[PDB]
């Protein structure tokens, strides 16, 4: 099958530059365009441009003209996008996607995406605080001041699934992220069953387990 | 079927060597001249060399004399370009073409990358026009070129296409709206009513003498704003199993007049997943997409239809145009499952003393498993209505019960949290006959 595999997530300071890669397999590399699409929080989908895999020449979206540069190395069937003078507004998921030149022209066969976070903040793991229990009771875990995204939150090492609500992360003035993970459980069980939220922050290789017992 | 296929291009270090091949098909090179024409990044077409296979007559350009060699094997029906001591200036896409002194057939070119005198004056360098516009490009010959002028069109990533030859003659297959004319050394290309597929770079060439010369190119671009796609509605709520409609309107037509195809696509976007193509050519369902998705429309309005919505169809749907640069997306349309009103269940969480160690207090009000989305949370401290220090997070719609959960955080400096003594959140929603307040003291 046609496949595009992108490089891993990146964290950069404002004003820095980032190079994202997109290894293509399963088709004749030179015969297609590699487009670069971006999704920034709340901005939808944006086409930054595409490069001919054969000519190595590009058409750029004039909104990024001069800040974005496309390249390809055919010897390794890889396409690169280099964004310079990074701003906080460039925090986004960047996708490479193939488009055809002969019969099919629609952008199909997307890469998995590359998260690029631009911030002054540095990579740090989360502080995990219990949200002690209040018919049905609610309890939770507050994962605070971690950078960059993301964080995974499970309950009882995956045993407890029903009634779990892990909210999307919020970007604080701090520039760090914090989210909440709550769960509804029958009040009576509070003294019988034990509840542990497992928090995993791979970007900093942090792993935390916290219990929420009644206050 | 005349065909020219270039091969052999690649990365060559400075002062390096490389051979390019041009395999001819459907005709014999013995019967004509073969040209190598190059195009440097961002620049125009540059004729580098020419050969007559029959007698091996070769003509080069002064730019490449002594560094480039052109040969041919009539037995193999192939032309060759040897390159040595290559310069940085040599990096370019090399096309092979053939001569009727017009370059009617071009290979799709091959990239050579060096990892370190009749003149034609084209006017204007750039040009902005709209579909339906009448456009005129001109090329002034630096001297007498009797009628020996051809016009070519080129789109990014593709080889030049012959449009006009001997200054007014329409190449087989070119549409009627294209014409060219001559007045002495003034040469004109003119497009009757600009079609969406005519936005490209146009090149004048004189075929009178040798070397053939090229104008620097006239880029024809969309005037004003980029093709804007506006979607309606911005958000959609329909019940499970019922039909969902999304419309997309384009600020100009996406229909190519030469092939009657709409360059419009429909994409689904779920959080955390890459965009998924659903429809291309405005009605062609991508192989593997579920039956229930369909696309219709043409010209400037298109419609995506989900015949019976499912919980796994909850996402943001985007229309997208690939007709002309820059390629653009619609603003998007959020589709969600419509269900019965569900009053939120309200909980309040005081700051953990563990968090109060940290020096800040976070009081949290949770609205669990409610529908619809509209919910107002107002914080009050000692019955003083608050404002300005609250932030809300919202979950994606739950797949099974189609509800939302909301978490509102009142953040205070631990000092101010020590100051006051009653904290409550008052929730307003369609499922609450009257606002519901939850409180705690310490």
Numbering used by the authors:
A (entry chain B): 1 to 134, 141 to 221
B (entry chain A): 1 to 99, 104 to 120, 148 to 473
Paper text:
The receptor tyrosine kinase HER2 acts as oncogenic driver in numerous cancers. One such driver gene is ERBB2, coding for HER2, an orphan member of the epidermal growth factor (EGF) receptor family. Here, we design an anti-HER2 biparatopic and tetravalent IgG fusion with a multimodal mechanism of action. Thus, the focus here was to interlink HER2 ECD D1 and 4 with an appropriately designed IgG derivative and to induce a HER2 “lockdown” into inactive, signaling-incompetent clusters.
Four closely related scFv–Fab fusions, termed 641, 641i, 841, and 841i, were created. For this set, the murine antibody A21 part was humanized, and we shortened the linker, connecting the two binders, to two amino acids (glycine and serine), since shorter linkers had shown superior activity. Henceforth, we reengineered the Fab interface to minimize the occurrence of these side products. We next determined the crystal structure of unliganded 841 to a resolution of 2.2 Å. This allowed us to verify that the charged residues of the designed mutations are indeed engaging in interactions and are in proximity of around 3 Å, as designed. Since a two amino acid linker of GS can only span at most about 4 Å and the HER2 ECD had been proven rigid, intramolecular binding can be excluded. Interestingly, 641 and 841 treatment decreased mobility within the cell membrane drastically; however, these scFv–Fab fusions did not induce a complete immobilization despite their high antiproliferative effect and the induction of apoptosis. When lowering the target density, 841 showed the most pronounced decrease in crosslinking rates, while the mAb combination and 441 were still able to maintain interlinking at lowest ligand densities. Nevertheless, the scFv–Fab constructs were already superior to the clinically used mAb combination TZB and PZB and induced apoptosis, regardless of incomplete HER2 lockdown.
